[PDB]
């Protein structure tokens, strides 16, 4: 509830908006609107690990006390870090979500927007801010079993960042249904079950419906150009339906390559022996499906909704939305998020990173689309990449087992790979290929771990982390895990970013390393 | 003609029926593959028809294109009875044959007339690759478009100069090819095919000089390539 505190935020304030996320633009674009809405001037925030914390913010050493919290939380005893408070409130609307006790009470200085059914944390101030030495210790290890059991065995992530701000809004004579669409790209960055969980997807298929299937506030006349608004539908998350044609769909996509084996010859002989059965013509296979004639794309779904019923691909039906201006086109909500880490480029300027974050919060404008051409173009090429290793690696391969996981090292960079979040998409693509099929799944559950080439930044073996497939929701241990040889030995090793599951080490002495961490 | 009736039965009975060589019999998955490749050119050997009823020599040459016929309407009516998924694209077909006897150039004569013939040849100069006609309409007043057309090119081949018989003149004749069977002619090559003999539509039929002017030509059911110089 921030029914009363909206209503504070009249005064001096700041927008920040967190560390790499697609997230921030989504929750904030909205409100650096709303600022100037409320005639309030709008301040905003490049942030790229807990570095640029103070380097920042102890530029600005003031009182301005209407302060938000996003992605971070997981950080200190956040008066023990941001001591320059003595009454100065925060705001916190963070997804970086398991977080300690010390941060929330002293409530004059944070804002409690946690109220959830499983209270089983409650003497962790009884037990730690509070603590016969051995009784003491019976209860303090005894019930560790479930707080250690918390932040010292795994890590996850929470709910929306302004799907909360939209609760506030929707009452508050606002319809745009433009950040509605907004709150889908906030929703398919991470609540995509096949990044990170919902399960109550499947009744959000009422909630926004709810919300909208209510609302045609022209329900009798809605038939113009200009933002027509929005339509449900039963569609895919495969790999960029539009603008290429089917047979790149069907090489690039990973719920084929997990249940079909396309990289390989009979995957391709058994793709055409299904187009056969949607008797598709094979030019028609190869031209963009804005490209192709019309009643076979029309068709399309009809059939393939259906008869793939029986081939071992179960999960291709999702519940989704797509929409347009005018007539150049129909976007889609999913044809966005692979274009949005586009711009994310890691290039050696030091302009790259954060100018490019001021472009991106440029882009999800109706009056800025060019751009988002652009990086449409380069998502596909990436794509294809990907393969510039597969191949090279599953049959050669470079795969490592180091026990009782899997182990994996590339030792050559990528202007592609500067950006690091490929290092989770590559593993979460091939692992599938030798380590999940050659062999039966007893020897494909366990997680995977990537090494990364720094040829750019002196060498410092860059990391992320991976679990095992079909059973996702059991959370990472390596929310813990990289601790270990840190915490047997500890070498050179940061924190830096926001995240647990991330680490820097040196060039040279990551080995000994991994045979502490072998463990 | 109800002779037409037995026909098809006894093809219907065997693309979809025959097994040989312990089971999988190509013509339940040549079809598909066919299919698969969008090619029309869905093969016969006539050792495998002998193997299952030689009747299919005999019956045959008192016009052998109605027997292509009486294969077309069978082809036709199993692909897109079986893959009325393919009634869409391309919804024409016609088969192969490779009777499997080597005969030779030079013997071809009054009485291999338009009759089942298998023989070889050697390739040379010819020309590019161009289309025709193919239906008959025009009229409406009381048509030069939207009428459907069939690639084409001409052949020239030549015979072996290994089996020559010892100076008589090499030879040369006059053949077809056609669309679906084209743009693999090239010089220098020879290759085997299934071949039937006939004349011009209508080759200078008149009083005339002291001798006609006339031709005979040849087109391919089915070619096998015999050189086959990569994988």
């Known amino acids: 509830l921030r029914n009363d505190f909206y209503r504070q935020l009249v005064g001096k304030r700041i927008l920040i908006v967190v560390n790499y996320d697609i997230d921030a633009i989504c929750a904030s674009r909205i409100l650096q609107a709303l600022f100037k809405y409320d005639h309030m001037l709008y301040t905003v925030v490049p942030i790229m690990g807990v570095t640029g914390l103070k380097r920042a913010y102890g530029e600005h050493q003031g009182d301005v006390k209407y302060v938000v919290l996003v992605n971070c939380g997981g950080c200190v005893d956040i008066v023990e870090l941001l001591q320059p408070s003595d009454d100065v409130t925060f705001f916190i609307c963070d997804s970086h979500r398991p977080l300690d006790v010390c941060n929330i009470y002293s409530d004059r200085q944070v804002c409690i927007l946690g109220d959830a059914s499983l209270e089983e944390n409650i003497p962790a101030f009884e037990t730690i801010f509070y603590d016969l030495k051995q009784r003491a210790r019976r209860q303090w290890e005894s019930e560790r079993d479930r707080i250690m059991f918390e932040y010292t065995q795994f890590s996850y992530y929470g709910r929306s960042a302004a799907l909360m701000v939209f609760e506030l809004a929707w009452k508050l004579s606002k319809d745009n249904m433009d950040l509605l669409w907004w709150a889908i790209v906030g929703i398919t960055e991470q609540l995509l079950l096949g990044k990170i969980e919902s399960g109550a997807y499947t009744l959000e298929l009422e909630q926004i419906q709810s919300h909208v299937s209510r609302l045609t506030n022209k329900t009798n006349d809605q038939n113009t150009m200009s933002a027509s608004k929005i339509t449900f539908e039963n569609d895919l998350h495969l790999v960029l339906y539009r603008h290429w044609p089917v047979t790149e769909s069907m090489r690039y996509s990973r719920y084929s390559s997990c249940q079909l084996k396309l990289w390989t010859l009979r995957g391709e002989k058994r793709l055409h022996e299904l187009l056969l059965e949607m008797g598709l013509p094979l030019v028609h296979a190869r031209q963009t499906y804005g490209a192709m004639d019309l009643v076979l794309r029309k068709e399309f779904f009809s059939m393939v909704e259906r008869l793939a019923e029986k081939y071992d691909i179960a999960d291709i039906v999702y519940g989704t939305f797509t929409l347009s201006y005018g007539y150049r086109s129909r976007y889609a909500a999913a ?6 880490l586009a711009i994310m480029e890691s290039v050696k300027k030091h302009k790259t990173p954060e100018d490019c974050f001021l472009e991106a919060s440029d882009a999800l404008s109706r009056q800025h689309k060019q751009l988002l051409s652009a990086g449409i173009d380069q998502a596909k090429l990436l794509h294809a990449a990907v393969f510039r290793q597969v191949q090279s690696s599953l049959e050669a391969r470079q795969v490592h087992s180091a026990g009782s996981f899997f182990y994996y090292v590339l030792q050559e960079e990528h202007a592609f790979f500067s950006y690091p979040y490929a290092l989770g998409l590559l593993a979460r693509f091939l692992l599938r290929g030798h380590v999940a099929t050659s062999r039966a799944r007893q020897a494909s559950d366990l997680p995977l771990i990537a090494s990364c080439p720094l040829n750019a930044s002196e060498g410092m073996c860059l990391l992320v982390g991976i679990v095992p497939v079909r059973e996702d929701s059991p959370r990472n241990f390596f929310g813990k895990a990289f601790e270990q040889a840190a915490q047997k030995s500890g070498v050179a090793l940061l924190q830096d970013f926001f995240e647990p599951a991330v680490v820097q080490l040196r060039q040279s002495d990551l080995t000994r390393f991994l045979d502490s961490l072998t463990v | 003609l109800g002779p037409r009736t037995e026909i098809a039965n006894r093809f219907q009975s065997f693309l979809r029926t025959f097994v040989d060589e ?28 002998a193997n299952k009823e030689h009747v299919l020599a005999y019956f045959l040459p008192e016009a052998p294109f109605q027997m292509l016929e009486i294969f077309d309407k069978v082809a036709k009516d199993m692909v897109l009875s079986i893959f009325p998924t393919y009634e869409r694209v391309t919804t024409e077909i016609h088969v192969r044959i490779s009777l499997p006897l080597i005969e030779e150039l030079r013997t071809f004569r009054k009485l291999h007339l338009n009759q089942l013939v298998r023989t070889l040849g050697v390739v040379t100069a010819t020309t590019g690759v161009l289309p025709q006609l193919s239906v008959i309409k025009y009229d409406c007043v009381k048509n030069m478009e939207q009428t459907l057309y069939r690639n084409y090119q001409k052949i020239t081949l030549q015979e072996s100069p290994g089996r020559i018989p010892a100076g008589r003149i090499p030879r040369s004749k ?16 020879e290759l085997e095919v299934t071949g ?19 031709a005979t030509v040849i087109i391919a059911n089915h070619v096998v390539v015999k050189d086959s110089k990569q994988v």
Do not use: H, W
């Not at chain 2, 053949?175 to 679906?180: E, N, S």
């Open chain 2, 174 to 189: 006059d053949v077809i090819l056609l669309a679906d069977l084209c743009d693999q002619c090239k010089p220098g090559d």
């Open chain 1, 335 to 340: 044809d966005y998020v692979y274009a949005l």
């Open chain 2, 22 to 49: 312990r089971g999988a019999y190509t013509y339940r998955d040549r079809i598909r593959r066919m299919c698969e490749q969008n090619m029309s050119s869905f093969v016969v050997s006539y050792t495998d028809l």
């Open chain 2, 196 to 214: 039937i003999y006939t004349n011009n539509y209508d080759g200078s039929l008149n009083t005339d000089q002291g001798f006609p002017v006339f």
